[PDB]
Each structure stands twice: as C-alpha cells, then as structure tokens.
Amino acid sequence: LPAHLRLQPIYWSRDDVAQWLKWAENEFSLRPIDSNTFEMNGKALLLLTKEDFRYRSPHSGDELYELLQHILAQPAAGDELKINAACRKVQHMVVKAALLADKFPVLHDIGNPKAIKCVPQADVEWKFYDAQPCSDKAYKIEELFYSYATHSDKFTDGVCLFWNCNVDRYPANSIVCRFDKSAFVNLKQLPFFYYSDSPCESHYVPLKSATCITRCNLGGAVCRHHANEYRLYLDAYNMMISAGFSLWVYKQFDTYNLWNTFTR
Ligand SMILES: Nc1ncnc2c1ncn2[C@@H]1O[C@H](CSCC[C@H](N)C(=O)O)[C@@H](O)[C@H]1O
Numbered sequence: 001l002p003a004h005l006r007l008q009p010i011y012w013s014r015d016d017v018a019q020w021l022k023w024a025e026n027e028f029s030l031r032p033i034d035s036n037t038f039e040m041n042g043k044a045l046l047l048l049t050k051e052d053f054r055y056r057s058p059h060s061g062d063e064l065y066e067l068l069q070h071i072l073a074q075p076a077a078g079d080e081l082k083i084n085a086a087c088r089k090v091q092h093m094v095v096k097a098a099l100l101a102d103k104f105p106v107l108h109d110i111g112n113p114k115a116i117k118c119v120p121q122a123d124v125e126w127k128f129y130d131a132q133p134c135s136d137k138a139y140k141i142e143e144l145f146y147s148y149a150t151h152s153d154k155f156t157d158g159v160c161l162f163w164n165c166n167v168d169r170y171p172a173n174s175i176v177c178r179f180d181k182s183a184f185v186n187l188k189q190l191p192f193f194y195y196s197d198s199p200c201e202s203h204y205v206p207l208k209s210a211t212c213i214t215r216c217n218l219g220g221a222v223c224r225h226h227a228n229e230y231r232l233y234l235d236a237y238n239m240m241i242s243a244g245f246s247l248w249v250y251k252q253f254d255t256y257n258l259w260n261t262f263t264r
Pocket residue numbers: 110111112113129130131132133144145146147162163164165166167
C-alpha cells in the first residue's frame with residue numbers, strides 16, 4: 001500500500017523494508033517483529049535465502065519470503081497519476097540541464113501535441129512537431145511524422161527532444177525517454193544526476209552523493225534544502241525507472257558542464 005512498496009523491491013530503501021514488515025504484519029496477522037529484524041535495503045533482501053528469512057524470523061520468515069516472491073512475480077499496479085508527475089519532474093530536470101550545459105539555440109520537440117514547453121524559462125527557440133497535433137494547438141505545431149530514414153539530415157541545429165515519442169531511430173542530437181536497442185545507436189544511456197541552481201538554505205541526515213550537482217556540493221556539504229530536493233527527485237526518478245522508462249542522451253552530454261555553471 002505505501003508508495004515506495006509499489007516500486008520493484010530492488011529500489012526499496014532500508015526504511016522501505018521496515019515499512020514492508022509492518023504492512024505484512026497487519027495484512028497477514030503475523031507476530032510483531034522488531035523493526036530491524038531485516039536491517040538492510042531491498043537489494044540486500046533479494047540476496048537472502050529462505051533459510052535466512054526463517055532464521056531471522058522463526059515465526060514469520062517463511063511467509064515473508066513467499067510474500068516477496070509473489071511481489072517479484074506480480075509487480076505492483078503503479079498509479080498513473082503519480083507516475084505521470086514523476087516523469088514530468090524528470091523531463092524538466094534533464095532538459096533544463098541539457099540546455100544549460102550545451103546552450104543549444106533551438107530545441108526541436110518531436111511528438112509534442114500540446115505545444116507545452118517542459119522548460120519554459122530557458123533561453124532557447126522552442127519548436128513543436130507531432131504527427132497528430134491537438135486541434136487546439138495545431139496552429140503552432142508542425143504536423144510531421146518523424147522517421148530517421150526521411151528526416152536524418154533535418155533538425156541538425158540545436159537539440160531534439162523525443163519524450164516518449166517512439167521513432168525508428170533517434171538522431172545524434174537528441175534527448176530521449178522511452179518506455180519498455182538499434183533505435184539508440186546514435187546515443188548513450190543517461191545516468192542519474194540531480195542539478196539545481198536554486199539558492200541554498202540551511203534550515204537532516206547529511207547527503208553524501210557525487211551526483212548531487214549543487215553549489216553546496218562543490219565542497220561536499222549539501223545544504224538541507226538541496227538534500228531534501230535531491231531525495232524527492234530521486235524518489236520521482238525511481239518511480240519512473242521502476243515503471244519501465246529509460247533515458248538516453250546525445251553522446252557529448254557532460255555533467256562537468258553543469259558543475260561549471262557555478263563559476264567553479
Ligand atoms: N513518428 C512520430 N513523429 C511525430 N510524432 C509522433 C511519432 N510517433 C508518435 N508521435 C506522437 O508522439 C506523441 C506521444 S504521447 C505525447 C508525448 C509527449 N512528448 C509528452 O511528453 O507528453 C503523440 O502525440 C503522437 O502523436
């Protein structure tokens with residue numbers, strides 16, 4: 001029932017595992033066990049044997065192991081509303097970062113039928129294209145079905161955005177999100193990062209992470225504000241990846257360009 005427990009268990013934190021024990025206690029009327037009977041994250045939980053479960057909880061371990069196997073076999077539903085919002089959070093993060101890092105003068109938003117910019121504050125010429133534009137936004141959307149075989153020498157200025165616009169093959173100058181390899185040969189996988197240029201504020205478990213690209217992490221002392229925002233962003237990102245989306249980017253994408261935005 002708890003939101004994190006709808007992620008695949010490989011994404012569960014140590015705290016998530018504890019909430020899982022409490023949920024299972026109530027759902028199955030099990031003997032209450034101490035909250036750190038399984039003091040590990042989900043990745044670790046998945047490495048335990050059924051015998052390890054029984055030793056760890058003589059009264060409920062076998063049940064807990066079998067519950068985990070059922071969760072692994074029939075993954076949780078997942079809420080479309082929350083997953084949508086998570087995907088939009090990531091879209092804004094990634095496209096904002098790309099525009100700041102590489103200063104593209106034009107963005108070709110291919111498969112956007114509503115003519116909405118995911119980074120409306122960016123200094124860039126935003127152009128929209130779609131095979132079936134919404135009739136109430138078609139006046140500013142180019143009606144176009146993208147195929148690499150037909151369009152690979154077009155849209156060569158700036159960057160192209162294909163946010164869940166599944167085409168035969170993406171051009172080299174692209175930012176892509178795709179739901180579940182030859183389509184991606186011109187691109188590389190985009191690893192997780194968090195970038196923020198919002199002001200630091202100090203008033204948490206300290207956040208240690210090389211992927212928190214903030215002014216306060218230049219010296220490894222992330223402020224409370226960016227610690228909180230990083231963890232919220234990571235939760236959204238996990239929701240997206242656990243649901244089956246994958247991110248791809250032009251091969252020159254470099255997070256050091258983001259560190260450099262801090263003058264440093
Ligand atoms: N080959 C193609 N060329 C242009 N648009 C395409 C396309 N294949 C699918 N589409 C369009 O891509 C959209 C996918 S759904 C909307 C995706 C949008 N980028 C978003 O993030 O909300 C639809 O509007 C559909 O008409």
